[PDB]
Design an enzyme around this catalytic site. Structure first.
Site, PDB file in Angstrom:
ATOM      1  N   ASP A   1      35.821  36.297  40.126  1.00 32.66           N
ATOM      2  CA  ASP A   1      36.964  36.431  40.934  1.00 32.66           C
ATOM      3  C   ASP A   1      38.134  36.068  39.864  1.00 32.66           C
ATOM      4  O   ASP A   1      37.787  35.309  38.889  1.00 32.66           O
ATOM      5  CB  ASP A   1      36.796  35.634  42.124  1.00 32.66           C
ATOM      6  CG  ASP A   1      36.755  34.274  41.655  1.00 32.66           C
ATOM      7  OD1 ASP A   1      36.004  33.895  40.608  1.00 32.66           O
ATOM      8  OD2 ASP A   1      37.246  33.235  42.292  1.00 32.66           O
TER       9      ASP A   1
ATOM     10  N   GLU B   1      37.767  41.003  40.061  1.00 34.25           N
ATOM     11  CA  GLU B   1      38.743  41.196  40.713  1.00 34.25           C
ATOM     12  C   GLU B   1      40.104  40.439  39.669  1.00 34.25           C
ATOM     13  O   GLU B   1      40.088  39.531  39.223  1.00 34.25           O
ATOM     14  CB  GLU B   1      38.633  40.339  41.952  1.00 34.25           C
ATOM     15  CG  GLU B   1      39.945  40.084  42.729  1.00 34.25           C
ATOM     16  CD  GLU B   1      40.629  38.632  42.677  1.00 34.25           C
ATOM     17  OE1 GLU B   1      40.055  37.832  43.370  1.00 34.25           O
ATOM     18  OE2 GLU B   1      41.678  38.644  42.128  1.00 34.25           O
TER      19      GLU B   1
END
Lengths: 305, 606, 301, 296
Positions: free
Chosen positions: B300, B342
């Site tokens: 992330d 991400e």
């Protein structure tokens, strides 16, 4: 930047022997860069026809080690110039110590922006030069003052190009290996024979341009003759417009009053303690060996140093 | 000696990707070996019940590379331990960075989280899954991820989560009924604050205690594999937790932190320059793929790594080479692993191989798609007319990376509203809107990810303190969304036209009907075709002609408006004979009636 | 496209005009060419209308122009620190059919001549400009150059004035003109440069940040062209570059050749490929990289 | 103040200032606040933060930006110079030239000033003169008093060797003499709006400023030439007629100046100038400040 942050570090050490490329006058296509060493000056300016001889129009900006640099657009080859250095209250006009060409305004000296472009014809000679190996080979030197050797008419010397073919033959007919030239560097009093020098980086105008001398060496080299130059690192010329008290203070001179008085030359000896003087002197050694391919340097009055 | 002389050299190199074999706590039958990385430590000692918590009992000896080692007889599995590291004048107690399980002495994690000596013996029964597993080759297979936070998913009783063991069978049964291929788990690594969801990690090498033992987690993973489900773990190399006992100033100085004050979330970033930091992190990545058979790793907030201010400039090279060498190392040791990133900047080649100057991830979340899609569907159908380009232009950016469609937990939390809550109109239309969105998400190129509760069209935002509102599964609209998501997943898993998300896999049919808010497009692999007709307005459209390349009978494969999904039931017969004259520059055309707020998916016959 | 219940900045009128403009031209003139300069990241400017594109055949790669120019004003000492600006251009080099563009717009209004933009002394300025064009011709995409850039004019383009053709007497300016002439000859003859798709480009090496060097490949079918670029005035000796094919390799162009005004450092025609692995390639050429120079090499045929 | 405002901190600052002056009624608290937060120097009972002084960082930025500019170009930036007085009484301010301005490549104050060495020394002598005239107390970071070349390097000692050379010794003399004028004359003690009156501010072409600094009887007239061009027959309006004295001239040779000066003995002429009853006919030295008061 004209000057690297490394080039200044080399200047502080006295280890720039290529200082000629950074210092003096260097033409580019739109103007020329000017670089002068004047550490104890409050301001340094270049004055010439290219700016109406006004100090304000182009003032050099100090970098490291009292080194001044600036670009003047429109400064061109063949232009005459002078540096106007201000030491506090007083101003004075100076010649470029690194001037590669000096021509007298009277015609009886002003630094000239010059290009040293020359294509050589002595490749074969350089490969064969003996140097240290010459000790086991013959050296027979013919010593010459170019002004005194041969004349076109009374009181008229031979040019660099002109003397080559007459001189090279005479030297060849007698079987000499080298010619030792009394100092070719620019000097005001011709009667000094060249031993009191103003332009250490400039060949004397009387016999031609820098290119005229380069060819003379070119020819002498092609014809198999060596050229030794007489060199004067022991002292510098008295005239003020020159190296004397350059930045307004002692610069090439000894700072201390006791050392400066000397026999034969007084306050005209080079201060070898200063790194800048060592740059100036040693760079000149290679400068003659590099841009003019001289085979030798003869140092006179070594005892005085 | 505990450490081979080659080891130390690998630790100095930054190449020790097996480091869990030697660092941390490793028990024998007569004692336990301890190994710590503490380069600026003047002394290190292990303290525990096995030695009077006496700091002089077992002083580990300094080896090379700042590594400390020692053997303690009688230190056994199930004891707690602690490192007392001395930095000159000052002394401090620290937890094991390589702790394989951590457990709270108090019973409350935010109070204390101590390291426990553990043996990791576990026997797997997932051979068949691991022999057929396909990582990077999955680009040409359907990947449909069900994202889950384990504590929040189901509660055994109010306010108490399911154990790893106890969760296995409910999770596998439900995922299979849904037809999802993988489960993505929000970070399992040990963390003090439950409300962190795991993103503030203290124990990278320890699965969280709240759901059971380390082997309990492997049993869960083992079980899920036998059921044919993949497990992707959320991994947080972006930062470490702000807990004093943790990694912060381990030696009394910066260690996992940047040595330099100026750079460095703040401060609690990993110094990717340090060979030890890259070792610790990269070994941990493989550690999860190695000891826990994890199928994928999802990173992330990559932008926080790539740049420094989210002549050196904004980009941080340290991080990019680490990210690159991270991905390279994973695929070298596990050719069938999966890495997902991400990145909320438009950093190019996230999904690209390192040898092409890419970051080396296999997948990127298409968050642009998520934003555009969501921004589009909240708008009232009257207005979707005026924003038509938001929908159609999603495909101009749909092939820049290998993308996963990203409906995520972050989208449904902090005031953003449930996916259900987001949709406009009365309850019938919201369920319709939600069915349309999922229909379009499955049709759009890219892999599909859906967070817990989206499959019901759950009313409330995700609350980690409770379980999703499974009671809504009783009211009709919500089982219909679930039936719709399952049927979509069954269609996805079977029709290879949807497996290929490259530009080859998509052809436009029509995108110019701004006034009626209708979209027609094709999804193709080889002979196989799927036609998508989408009505983003309630107004039913009749005799809507749609061009198609091949003639003959066409079948209606899925109808968003079928009553089984909670729809009006307006539908084509399911037998549709193509008209041999042109529409949309196509040789034939299908004349359909488009149901309200519905998606039609159509296929030619044999 | 843009103008600054609906609340839409996109001027949809114009977008349909552009689409119907492009459609009409190619219908009446199937062999016309339409080019657009669009300084936003509007997708599919160069795309056909039936795929929701604007319908142009070519789009100006102004991103490339910005990045490349910003990279080359920086001094080589600093080029280490901006390496990603050079390499990153390829990422976006294939979203449109693109024309690499250098235009009046960049040589006016105090932005300075292309020559003026390049850092260092006169030799380096000529070298830098020779490299810029070299990489520009090697980089994927069609080529556009505005008047006076071809000889490296000092002055900004002035419409009230004529170009400084007198500069063609200076050697460096003549060399830049010859370099461009030679570039176009290679361009016209080697089809490896005709195909600006991802097909035609392969990276050889992009990770030499200290010495600021990049190696890439251009290939259509069997034919391939090797590009090695030295973006620093420091010469590189025994620099190895991995290559796909072994055997003798030819030096097709050397930016540093004296005919262009360069130092003349080079590899003398034939380099022999060594069957030793480099840059993940089976063979490699061990070459000499001249100062601020681009080398174009061909396998021997 | 921020993180949007942090009230924890705002109540803390307010209580800090409230507590200090209670236990030490004659202490001084000074604040540097880089946003336009109002009432830093205002008492807490008026919703101020309770400080006595604020660093005028707005002034410093405008002032430095103006003098970084060349006198040839200062024409086009005249408003940056003149407009400092709109914001000059918003708080009880200290004019500030701190260490933060001579670090991280920002350059020594000397380095910042344009032109050759003389103009650099002239510019800094002019800058300080205007700063001493401008309303507000004065702060100068060490080494600014010689106008040292190098940025403040804490790992070394200041370049005191420059105190041997003329230009830097002159600036040190100028700061000392300015400080003498400051303490001797109360016209500079009152940094209130009442203390300052404009004489002329619209000479943009010649880049000149004339202003008055007042307390009751006393007036101090400040005339500033921001271009290296001497100005002759430059008339400046004044309230009072009679003999005027030249109290200070930046261009005195003792400071490193050219030495053009009125040197005292200036008599007001009763011809209206600058909307004023009497006018002075003066010589404006290059890049210099003249400070004049009525003879008494």
């Amino acid at each position: 930047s004209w000057l690297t942050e490394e080039d200044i570090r080399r200047w502080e050490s006295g280890t720039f022997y290529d200082s000629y490329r950074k210092l003096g006058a260097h033409p580019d296509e739109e103007g020329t860069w000017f670089c002068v060493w004047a550490p104890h000056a409050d301001a340094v300016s270049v004055l010439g026809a290219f700016n109406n001889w006004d100090p304000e129009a182009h003032q050099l900006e100090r970098y490291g080690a009292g080194l001044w640099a600036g670009y003047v657009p429109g400064a061109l080859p063949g232009h005459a110039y002078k540096y106007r250095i201000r030491h506090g209250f007083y101003q004075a006009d100076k010649t470029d110590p690194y001037a590669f060409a000096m021509e007298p305004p009277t015609g009886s000296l002003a630094s000239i922006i010059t290009r040293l472009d020359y294509t050589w014809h002595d490749d074969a000679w350089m490969q064969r030069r003996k140097g240290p190996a010459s000790l086991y080979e013959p050296v027979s030197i013919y010593e010459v003052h170019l002004g005194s050797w041969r004349h076109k008419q009374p009181g008229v010397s031979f040019s660099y190009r002109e003397i080559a073919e007459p001189l090279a033959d005479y030297v060849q007919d007698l079987g000499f290996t080298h010619v030792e030239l009394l100092p070719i560097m620019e000097h005001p009093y011709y009667g000094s024979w060249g031993y009191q020098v103003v332009g250490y980086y400039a060949p004397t105008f009387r016999y031609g341009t820098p290119q005229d001398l380069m060819y003379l060496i070119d020819y002498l080299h092609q014809r198999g003759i060596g050229v030794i130059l007489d060199w004067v690192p022991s002292h510098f010329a008295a005239d003020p417009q020159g190296l004397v008290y350059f930045d307004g203070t002692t610069l090439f001179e000894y700072d201390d009053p006791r050392m400066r008085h000397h026999p034969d030359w007084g306050t005209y000896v080079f201060d070898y303690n200063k790194p800048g003087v060592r740059n100036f002197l040693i760079s000149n050694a290679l400068f003659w060996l590099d841009y003019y391919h001289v085979d030798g340097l003869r140092v006179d009055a070594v005892a005085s140093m | 000696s505990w450490l081979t002389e080659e080891d130390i050299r690998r630790w100095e190199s930054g190449t020790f990707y097996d480091s869990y074999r030697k660092l941390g706590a490793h028990p024998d039958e007569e004692g336990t070996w301890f190994c710590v990385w503490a380069p600026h430590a003047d002394a290190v000692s292990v303290l525990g019940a096995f030695n009077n918590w006496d700091p002089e009992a077992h002083q580990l000896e300094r080896y090379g590379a700042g590594l400390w080692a020692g053997y303690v007889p009688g230190a056994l599995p199930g004891h707690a331990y602690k490192y007392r590291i001395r930095h000159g004048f000052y002394q401090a107690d620290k937890t094991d960075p390589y702790a394989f399980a951590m457990e709270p002495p108090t019973g409350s994690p935010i109070e204390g989280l101590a390291s426990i000596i553990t043996r990791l013996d576990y026997t797997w029964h997932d051979d068949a899954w691991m022999q057929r597993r396909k990582g990077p080759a999955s680009l040409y297979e359907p990947v449909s991820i069900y994202e889950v936070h384990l504590g929040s998913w189901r509660h055994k009783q109010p306010g108490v989560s399911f154990s790893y063991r106890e969760i296995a069978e409910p999770l596998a049964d439900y995922v299979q009924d849904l037809g999802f291929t993988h489960v993505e788990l929000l970070p399992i690594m040990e963390h003090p604050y439950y409300g962190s969801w795991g993103y503030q990690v203290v124990g990278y090498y320890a699965p969280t205690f709240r759901y059971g033992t380390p082997q309990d987690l492997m049993y869960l993973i083992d079980y899920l594999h036998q059921r044919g489900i993949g497990v992707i773990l959320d991994w947080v190399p972006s930062h470490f937790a702000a807990d004093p006992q943790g990694l912060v100033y381990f030696d009394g100085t910066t260690l996992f932190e940047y040595d330099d004050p100026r750079m460095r979330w703040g401060t609690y970033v990993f110094d990717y320059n340090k060979p030890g930091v890259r070792n610790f992190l990269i070994s941990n990545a493989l550690f999860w793929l190695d000891y826990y058979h994890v199928d994928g790793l999802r990173v992330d907030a990559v932008a926080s790594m790539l740049y420094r201010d989210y002549f050196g400039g904004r980009e941080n090279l340290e991080a990019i080479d680490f990210i690159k060498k991270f991905n390279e190392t994973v695929y070298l040791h596990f050719p069938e692993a999966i890495t997902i990133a991400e990145e909320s900047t438009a950093w190019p080649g996230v999904s690209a191989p390192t040898y092409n100057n890419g970051l080396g991830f296999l997948y990127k979340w298409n968050m642009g798609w998520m934003h555009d899609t969501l921004d589009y569907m909240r708008r009232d159908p009257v207005h979707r007319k005026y924003h038509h380009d938001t929908l159609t232009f999603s495909l101009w950016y749909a092939f820049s990376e290998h993308y996963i469609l990203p409906l995520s937990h972050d989208e449904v939390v902090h005031g953003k509203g449930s996916l259900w809550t987001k949709m406009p109109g009365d309850d019938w239309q919201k369920a319709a809107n939600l069915r349309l969105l999922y229909g379009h998400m499955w049709g759009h190129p890219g892999k599909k990810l859906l967070f817990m509760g989206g499959e019901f069209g759950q009313h409330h935002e995700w609350n980690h303190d409770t379980q999703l509102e499974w009671h809504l599964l009783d009211q009709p609209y919500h089982r219909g969304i679930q039936a719709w998501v399952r049927d979509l997943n069954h269609l996805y898993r079977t029709h290879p036209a949807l497996w290929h998300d490259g530009p080859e896999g998509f052809e436009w049919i029509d995108f110019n009907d701004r006034d009626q808010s209708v979209i027609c497009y094709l999804r193709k692999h080889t002979d196989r075709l799927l036609l998508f007709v989408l009505n983003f307005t309630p107004v039913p459209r009749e005799h809507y002609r749609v061009g198609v390349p091949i003639g003959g009978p066409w079948r209606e494969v899925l109808n968003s408006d079928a009553v089984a999904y909670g729809g009006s039931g307006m539908g084509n017969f399911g037998r549709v004979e193509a008209v041999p004259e042109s529409w949309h520059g196509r040789p034939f055309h299908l004349e359909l009636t488009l149901p309200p707020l519905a998606i039609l998916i159509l296929e030619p016959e044999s | 496209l843009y103008r600054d219940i609906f609340g839409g900045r996109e001027n949809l009128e114009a977008i349909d005009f552009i689409k119907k403009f492009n459609e009409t031209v190619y219908l009446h003139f199937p062999e016309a060419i339409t080019i657009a300069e669009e300084s936003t990241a509007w997708p599919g400017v160069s795309a056909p209308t039936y795929n929701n594109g604007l319908g142009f055949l070519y789009k100006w790669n102004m991103g490339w122009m910005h990045d490349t120019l910003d990279y080359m004003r920086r001094d080589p000492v600093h080029r280490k620190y901006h390496h990603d600006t050079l390499t990153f251009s390829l990422w976006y080099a294939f979203s449109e059919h693109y024309i690499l563009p250098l235009s009046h717009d960049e040589v006016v209004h105090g932005k300075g001549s292309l020559w003026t933009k390049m850092p260092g002394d006169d030799w380096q300025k000529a070298a830098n400009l020779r490299l810029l064009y070299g990489h520009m011709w090697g980089h994927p995409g069609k080529k556009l150059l505005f008047m006076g850039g071809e000889f490296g004019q000092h002055h900004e383009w002035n419409h009230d004035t004529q170009l400084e053709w007198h500069l063609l007497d200076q050697p460096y300016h003549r060399g830049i003109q010859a370099w461009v002439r030679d570039l176009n000859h290679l361009y016209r003859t080697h089809p490896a440069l005709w195909h600006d798709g991802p097909e035609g480009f392969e990276w050889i090496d992009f990770n030499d940040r200290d010495q600021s060097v990049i190696c890439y490949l251009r290939k259509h079918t069997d034919r391939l062209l090797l590009f090695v670029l030295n973006f620093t005035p420091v010469p590189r000796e025994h620099y190895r570059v991995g290559v796909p094919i072994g055997g003798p390799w030819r030096e097709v162009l050397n930016s540093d050749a004296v005919a262009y005004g360069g130092s003349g450092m080079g590899n003398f025609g034939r380099v022999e490929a060594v069957p030793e692995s480099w840059h993940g390639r089976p063979f490699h050429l061990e070459l000499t990289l001249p100062p601020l120079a681009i080398l174009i090499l061909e396998p021997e045929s």
